[PDB]
Design an enzyme around this catalytic site. Structure first.
Site, PDB file in Angstrom:
ATOM      1  N   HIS A   1      43.525  41.569  58.951  1.00 21.46           N
ATOM      2  CA  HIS A   1      43.308  42.398  59.990  1.00 21.46           C
ATOM      3  C   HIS A   1      42.645  41.448  61.281  1.00 21.46           C
ATOM      4  CE1 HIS A   1      39.227  42.092  57.908  1.00 21.46           C
ATOM      5  NE2 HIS A   1      38.651  42.034  59.140  1.00 21.46           N
TER       6      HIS A   1
ATOM      7  N   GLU B   1      33.676  22.789  63.857  1.00 22.70           N
ATOM      8  CA  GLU B   1      32.656  23.488  64.721  1.00 22.70           C
ATOM      9  C   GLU B   1      31.443  23.899  64.336  1.00 22.70           C
ATOM     10  OE1 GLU B   1      34.524  25.200  68.815  1.00 22.70           O
ATOM     11  OE2 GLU B   1      32.735  24.498  67.902  1.00 22.70           O
TER      12      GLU B   1
ATOM     13  N   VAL C   1      29.255  25.437  72.652  1.00 22.35           N
ATOM     14  CA  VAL C   1      29.179  24.038  73.218  1.00 22.35           C
ATOM     15  C   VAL C   1      29.985  23.191  72.659  1.00 22.35           C
ATOM     16  CG1 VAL C   1      27.463  22.300  73.928  1.00 22.35           C
ATOM     17  CG2 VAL C   1      26.742  24.648  73.965  1.00 22.35           C
TER      18      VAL C   1
ATOM     19  N   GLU D   1      34.699  18.884  67.503  1.00 20.24           N
ATOM     20  CA  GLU D   1      35.951  19.846  67.496  1.00 20.24           C
ATOM     21  C   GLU D   1      37.403  19.413  67.653  1.00 20.24           C
ATOM     22  OE1 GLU D   1      33.242  19.431  69.662  1.00 20.24           O
ATOM     23  OE2 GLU D   1      32.261  21.415  69.680  1.00 20.24           O
TER      24      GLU D   1
ATOM     25  N   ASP E   1      44.269  42.425  52.208  1.00 18.47           N
ATOM     26  CA  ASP E   1      43.686  41.854  53.338  1.00 18.47           C
ATOM     27  C   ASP E   1      43.814  40.410  53.529  1.00 18.47           C
ATOM     28  OD1 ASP E   1      42.764  41.917  56.091  1.00 18.47           O
ATOM     29  OD2 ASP E   1      40.784  42.630  55.427  1.00 18.47           O
TER      30      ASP E   1
ATOM     31  N   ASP F   1      24.042  40.168  53.933  1.00 23.59           N
ATOM     32  CA  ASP F   1      25.512  40.449  54.120  1.00 23.59           C
ATOM     33  C   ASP F   1      26.319  39.703  55.126  1.00 23.59           C
ATOM     34  OD1 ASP F   1      27.014  43.743  53.953  1.00 23.59           O
ATOM     35  OD2 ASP F   1      27.836  42.129  53.216  1.00 23.59           O
TER      36      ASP F   1
ATOM     37  N   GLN G   1      30.184  41.968  61.244  1.00 19.02           N
ATOM     38  CA  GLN G   1      31.204  41.792  62.278  1.00 19.02           C
ATOM     39  C   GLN G   1      31.313  40.211  63.012  1.00 19.02           C
ATOM     40  OE1 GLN G   1      29.760  44.861  62.079  1.00 19.02           O
ATOM     41  NE2 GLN G   1      31.824  45.450  61.253  1.00 19.02           N
ATOM     42  N   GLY G   2      32.326  39.572  63.070  1.00 23.40           N
ATOM     43  CA  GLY G   2      32.456  38.631  63.404  1.00 23.40           C
ATOM     44  C   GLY G   2      32.670  37.491  62.332  1.00 23.40           C
TER      45      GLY G   2
ATOM     46  N   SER H   1      34.724  38.158  59.471  1.00 23.38           N
ATOM     47  CA  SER H   1      35.875  38.625  58.716  1.00 23.38           C
ATOM     48  C   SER H   1      37.016  37.380  58.828  1.00 23.38           C
ATOM     49  CB  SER H   1      36.712  39.591  59.707  1.00 23.38           C
ATOM     50  OG  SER H   1      36.480  40.913  58.963  1.00 23.38           O
ATOM     51  N   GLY H   2      37.703  37.244  57.839  1.00 20.61           N
ATOM     52  CA  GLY H   2      38.572  36.102  57.462  1.00 20.61           C
ATOM     53  C   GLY H   2      37.904  34.727  57.076  1.00 20.61           C
TER      54      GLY H   2
HETATM   55 CA   LIG Z   1      31.218  23.453  69.533  1.00 18.67          CA
END
Ligand SMILES: [Ca+2]
Lengths: 223, 58
Positions: A40, A52, A57, A62, A84, A171, A174-175, A177-178
């Protein structure tokens, strides 16, 4: 991640952020050219951000690499959420050393009770919204298929597993996922779905990676 | 009626943080909200233009 803690700069080297003009999903580096995420989380124009910590920033560790291929499992069902999983190929190989490293795939499935590490840059509030700058971590146990099915009647397939605490408060959200669910150095799950976040009797649901090892290896090798 | 443009935005059960647009009849404009990645309802658009075209004036 709700009820977690600050991981610490690059302490989870296999954790990546999927960016489409902003962070929208997490992912797990399993090879210098491949990332595992949720189906998804499919989007065109994905840019994978490795190394990261503070996603808002530039800190100097990175690596921004575009996705050259985003392969959603052929049997992914956008209604039942079965299968999924998605494999993302990096346009160029990522540079691995210490702050950027791959995570091993499982050799066997994990049993209920196994403690795992879940991480991500998702919402940190169960009621409301608060997105962190730095990566958040959470230790949570894999739950029995029986308890998972009891929590989500007629919704848990053989390719999903629950992890977390039934009392609530801890838990993925949102954010996230994956993102990864790593147990004993093996990638056992992918942050998938759940009823709200950190709600009592509603543990997070994760894609059961151990069921896809052969598919992952063969797909990566044939692309 | 039931106009899907008048339904509150639906994040859904999935855990992504995807920015989508929904028509806010109370404010008379298309606004952004967090979509989880799955089981989207119809008052969910990929752009303000799509939202306005479909729901403007609801
Ligand atoms: Ca960064």
């Amino acid at each position: 991640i709700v009820g977690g803690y600050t991981c610490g700069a690059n302490t989870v080297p296999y954790q990546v952020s999927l960016n489409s003009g902003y962070h929208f999903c997490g992912g797990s580096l399993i090879n210098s050219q491949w990332v595992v995420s949720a189906a998804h989380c499919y989007k065109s124009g994905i840019q994978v951000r490795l190394g990261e910590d503070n996603i808002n920033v530039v800190e100097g560790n990175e690596q921004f690499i575009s996705a050259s291929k985003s392969i959603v499992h052929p049997s992914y069902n956008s209604n039942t959420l079965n299968n999924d999983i998605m494999l993302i190929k990096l346009k160029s190989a990522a540079s691995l050393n210490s702050r950027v490293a791959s995570i091993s795939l499982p050799t066997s499935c994990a049993s209920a009770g196994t403690q795992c590490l879940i991480s991500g840059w998702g919402n940190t509030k169960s009621s409301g919204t608060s997105y962190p700058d730095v990566l958040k971590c959470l230790k949570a146990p894999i739950l029995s298929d029986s308890s998972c099915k009891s929590a989500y009647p007629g919704q848990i397939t053989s390719n999903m597993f629950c992890a977390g605490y039934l009392e609530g408060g801890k838990d993925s959200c949102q954010g996230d996922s994956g993102g990864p669910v790593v147990c004993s150095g093996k990638l056992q799950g992918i942050v998938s779905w759940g009823s709200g976040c950190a709600q009592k009797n509603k543990p997070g649901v994760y894609t059961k990676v151990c069921n896809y090892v052969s598919w992952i290896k063969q797909t990566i090798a044939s692309n | 009626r039931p106009d899907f443009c008048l339904e509150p935005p639906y994040t859904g059960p999935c855990g992504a943080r995807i920015i989508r647009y929904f028509y806010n009849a109370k404010a008379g404009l298309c606004q952004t909200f967090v979509y989880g990645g799955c089981r989207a309802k119809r008052n969910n658009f990929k752009s303000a233009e799509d939202c306005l075209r479909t729901c403007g004036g609801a």
